[PDB]
Swiss-Prot record, chain D:
It comes from the Eukaryota. GO terms for molecular function: protein heterodimerization activity; RNA binding. The modification N6-acetyllysine is found at residue 54. Keywords: Acetylation, Cytoplasm, mRNA processing, mRNA splicing, Nucleus, Ribonucleoprotein, RNA-binding, rRNA processing, Spliceosome, tRNA processing. It comes from Homo sapiens. GO terms for cellular component: cytoplasm; cytosol; Lsm2-8 complex; nucleolus; nucleoplasm; nucleus; P-body; small nuclear ribonucleoprotein complex. This is U6 snRNA-associated Sm-like protein LSm6. Its main location: cytoplasm.
Curated annotation (Swiss-Prot), chain E:
Plays a role in pre-mRNA splicing as component of the U4/U6-U5 tri-snRNP complex that is involved in spliceosome assembly, and as component of the precatalytic spliceosome (spliceosome B complex). The heptameric LSM2-8 complex binds specifically to the 3'-terminal U-tract of U6 snRNA. Residues 3-85 form the Sm domain. This is U6 snRNA-associated Sm-like protein LSm3. GO terms for molecular function: RNA binding; U6 snRNA 3'-end binding. Belongs to the snRNP Sm proteins family. Component of the precatalytic spliceosome (spliceosome B complex). Component of the U4/U6-U5 tri-snRNP complex, a building block of the precatalytic spliceosome (spliceosome B complex). The U4/U6-U5 tri-snRNP complex is composed of the U4, U6 and U5 snRNAs and at least PRPF3, PRPF4, PRPF6, PRPF8, PRPF31, SNRNP200, TXNL4A, SNRNP40, SNRPB, SNRPD1, SNRPD2, SNRPD3, SNRPE, SNRPF, SNRPG, DDX23, CD2BP2, PPIH, SNU13, EFTUD2, SART1 and USP39, plus LSM2, LSM3, LSM4, LSM5, LSM6, LSM7 and LSM8. Its main location: nucleus. One of its GO terms (biological process) is P-body assembly. It comes from Homo sapiens. Transmembrane segments: none annotated.
Swiss-Prot record, chain F:
GO terms for molecular function: protein heterodimerization activity; RNA binding. Component of the precatalytic spliceosome (spliceosome B complex). Component of the U4/U6-U5 tri-snRNP complex, a building block of the precatalytic spliceosome (spliceosome B complex). The U4/U6-U5 tri-snRNP complex is composed of the U4, U6 and U5 snRNAs and at least PRPF3, PRPF4, PRPF6, PRPF8, PRPF31, SNRNP200, TXNL4A, SNRNP40, SNRPB, SNRPD1, SNRPD2, SNRPD3, SNRPE, SNRPF, SNRPG, DDX23, CD2BP2, PPIH, SNU13, EFTUD2, SART1 and USP39, plus LSM2, LSM3, LSM4, LSM5, LSM6, LSM7 and LSM8. GO terms for cellular component: cytoplasm; cytosol; Lsm1-7-Pat1 complex; Lsm2-8 complex; nucleoplasm; nucleus; U2-type precatalytic spliceosome; U4/U6 x U5 tri-snRNP complex. This is U6 snRNA-associated Sm-like protein LSm5. It is found in: Nucleus. Belongs to the snRNP Sm proteins family. GO terms for biological process: mRNA catabolic process; mRNA processing; mRNA splicing, via spliceosome; response to bacterium. Residues 1-76 form the Sm domain. Plays a role in pre-mRNA splicing as component of the U4/U6-U5 tri-snRNP complex that is involved in spliceosome assembly, and as component of the precatalytic spliceosome (spliceosome B complex). The heptameric LSM2-8 complex binds specifically to the 3'-terminal U-tract of U6 snRNA. Keywords: Acetylation, mRNA processing, mRNA splicing, Nucleus, Ribonucleoprotein, RNA-binding, Spliceosome.
UniProtKB/Swiss-Prot annotation, chain G:
The chain holds residues 11 to 87 of 103 of the full protein. It comes from Homo sapiens. GO terms for cellular component: catalytic step 2 spliceosome; cytosol; Lsm1-7-Pat1 complex; Lsm2-8 complex; nucleoplasm; nucleus; spliceosomal tri-snRNP complex; U12-type spliceosomal complex. This is U6 snRNA-associated Sm-like protein LSm7. GO terms for biological process: mRNA splicing, via spliceosome; nuclear-transcribed mRNA catabolic process. Belongs to the snRNP Sm proteins family. Transmembrane segments: none annotated. Residues 1-77 form the Sm domain. One of its GO terms (molecular function) is U6 snRNA binding.
Length: 95, 95, 73, 72, 85, 76, 77
């Protein structure tokens, strides 16, 4: 519930999501689900352009099971609120 | 809500867990990532033999294999672009 | 909608390709909500084309199914 | 009841936990849970010899851990 | 009963190193964590280690690549272990 | 029933072979609703190298997520 | 649920698992969670050099129990 809320609070910002097959795609987060699904609008390739798989896709829906790394700016996330939410979730999941 | 209702009855490219892209049209979708598509064709063999690119139609891809699905800006039916075979093969999701 | 299409695919030919590269071409006769398939007259062949054995009935789990090739009809 | 009684009588004893990848972590089992999660300090790593020496508490998830056996 | 998740939550906002699959490591301040081992850490540094093989003598040479990020979230499916540096 | 056989196999020797080329033979101490079981003095042997890996004599909790086969009575 | 094991409660079946290993034998008991208990179990592994000649890498176990969580396919024999 903490990760879905963190994905919902970061909607509308430009971030780069990396897949398990070393593919990275940058775009604006449009929506998120309970299973950490990623939806990127205005999707583009990263700094290497060695993967012309689609090359004409602006909206990409990627599952949460394939995403390995999600790079985000530090100004778009608060450390103390995320730490308090993590400390609450660690007590709520175990009880 | 991150749903695949916007990609129904439109051209879309789905990536498998083995690292293979397939362009088709998702006919129906559900709460699992397993989806039924039509007019499935590869993209790594379209530059060598266009007849061998179209493998089959109306096949169901499982949810454990589908990694990411991106929508294409198809203006009309039977129109596709951006194909190449001189690119590096993508790796698998397992590492 | 994939589950309804699989339930409506009774007595239809199909080819189930597993995650381990094994392929089974048969006629699906029973389906469940967890994508479990029960097919009649299924022939099992490998990824390289080597046929292993033939069975009059076969049961394949949905967790071990990678792809399902159905005809255009 | 019996895995809970086994995990209850294993706190403080030194144990080695082998994961699914084949790496083993040996040390004093400080904390354990019902989902096979382990937290052990001073855990040495053995895959093909000595791989890494830990000076603090090392955490191993239960989803990738294969087995855990007490050292004697 | 001290849980391992409650023990990992006591090391919040401190420098830690997480070893993941495919011979990768990350070092940084763990800002958020959950029960599924998903970690969102600020000021992260990732190191990917590879082994090159010689064509003649077949000797293994260890090489490393390093990258930095201001903030990064990683799922718990790929993370193998966590430790202090 | 498989669960009745697993309950009757407690207290005696049993071998649990995983999905890979690995097995653990020892005295079955107890089991739960999950396939993870407790073993006493379990010896681990790898089949594809065909050799023992570690000989521990204690209470070992083997997770059943990768447990493939369970044979009471040990090997032959 | 969908596949009734009562037709195979006294017949020899072969079950292939997700891990690549396969077993063959006469099933003696079944479970609603796809767990099986069979007597006279012969287990064969999956090797890159042993594809058609799978009779060399075969081991015997007798009375064995296979869990339904790792079962991938079942076939009559």
């Amino acid at each position: 519930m903490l990760f879905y809320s963190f994905f919902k609070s970061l909607v509308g910002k430009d971030v780069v999501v990396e897949l398990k097959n070393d593919l990275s795609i940058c775009g604006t987060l449009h929506s998120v689900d309970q299973y950490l699904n990623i939806k990127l609008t205005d999707i583009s390739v990263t700094d290497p352009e060695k993967y012309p798989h689609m090359l004409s896709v602006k909206n990409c829906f990627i599952r949460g099971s394939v995403v390995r790394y999600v790079q985000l700016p530090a100004d778009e996330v608060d450390t103390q609120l995320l730490q308090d939410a993590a400390r609450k979730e660690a007590l709520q999941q175990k009880q | 809500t991150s749903a695949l209702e916007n990609y129904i009855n439109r051209t879309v490219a789905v990536i498998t867990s083995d690292g293979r892209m397939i362009v088709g049209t998702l006919k129906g979708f559900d709460q699992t990532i397993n989806l039924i598509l039509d007019e499935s064709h590869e993209r790594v063999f379209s530059s060598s033999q266009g007849v061998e690119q179209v493998v089959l139609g109306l096949y169901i891809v499982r949810g454990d294999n589908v990694a990411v699905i991106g929508e294409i800006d198809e203006e009309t039916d039977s129109a596709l672009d951006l194909g190449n075979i001189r690119a590096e093969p993508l790796n698998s999701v397992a590492h | 909608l994939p589950l309804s299409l699989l339930k409506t695919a009774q007595n239809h030919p199909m080819l189930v390709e597993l995650k381990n590269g094994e392929t089974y071409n048969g006629h699906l006769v029973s389906c469940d909500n967890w994508m479990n398939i029960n097919l009649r007259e299924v022939i099992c062949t490998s990824r390289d084309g080597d046929k292993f054995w033939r069975m009059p009935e076969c049961y394949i789990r949905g967790s071990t199914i990678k792809y399902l090739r159905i005809p255009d009809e | 009841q019996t895995p809970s009684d086994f995990l209850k009588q294993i706190i403080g004893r030194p144990v080695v936990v082998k994961l699914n990848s084949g790496v083993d972590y040996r040390g004093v089992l400080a904390c354990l849970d019902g989902y096979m999660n382990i937290a052990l300090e001073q855990t040495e790593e053995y895959v093909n010899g000595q791989l890494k020496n830990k000076y603090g508490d090392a955490f191993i998830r239960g989803n990738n851990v294969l087995y855990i056996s007490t050292q004697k | 009963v001290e849980e391992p998740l409650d023990l990992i939550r006591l090391s919040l906002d401190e420098r830690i190193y997480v070893k993941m699959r495919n011979d990768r490591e990350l070092r940084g301040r763990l800002h958020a964590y959950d029960q599924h081992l998903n970690m969102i850490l600020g000021d992260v540094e990732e190191t990917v280690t590879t082994i090159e093989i010689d064509e003649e003598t077949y000797e293994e040479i260890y090489k490393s690549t390093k990258r930095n990020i201001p903030m990064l979230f990683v799922r718990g499916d790929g993370v193998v272990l966590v430790a202090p540096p | 029933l498989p669960l009745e056989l697993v309950d009757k196999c407690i207290g005696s020797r049993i071998h649990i072979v995983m999905k890979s080329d690995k097995e653990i033979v020892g005295t079955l101490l107890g089991f739960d609703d999950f396939v993870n079981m407790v073993l006493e003095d379990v010896t681990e042997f790898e089949i594809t190298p065909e050799g023992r890996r570690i000989t521990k004599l204690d209470q070992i909790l083997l997770n059943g997520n990768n447990i493939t086969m369970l044979v009471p009575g040990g090997e032959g | 649920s969908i596949l009734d094991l009562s037709k195979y409660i006294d017949k020899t079946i072969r079950v292939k698992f997700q891990g690549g290993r396969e077993a063959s034998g006469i099933l003696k008991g079944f479970d609603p969670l796809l767990n099986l208990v069979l007597d006279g179990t012969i287990e064969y592994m999956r090797d890159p050099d042993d594809q058609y000649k799978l009779t060399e890498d075969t081991r015997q176990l007798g009375l064995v129990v296979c869990r339904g969580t790792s079962v991938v396919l079942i076939c009559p024999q």
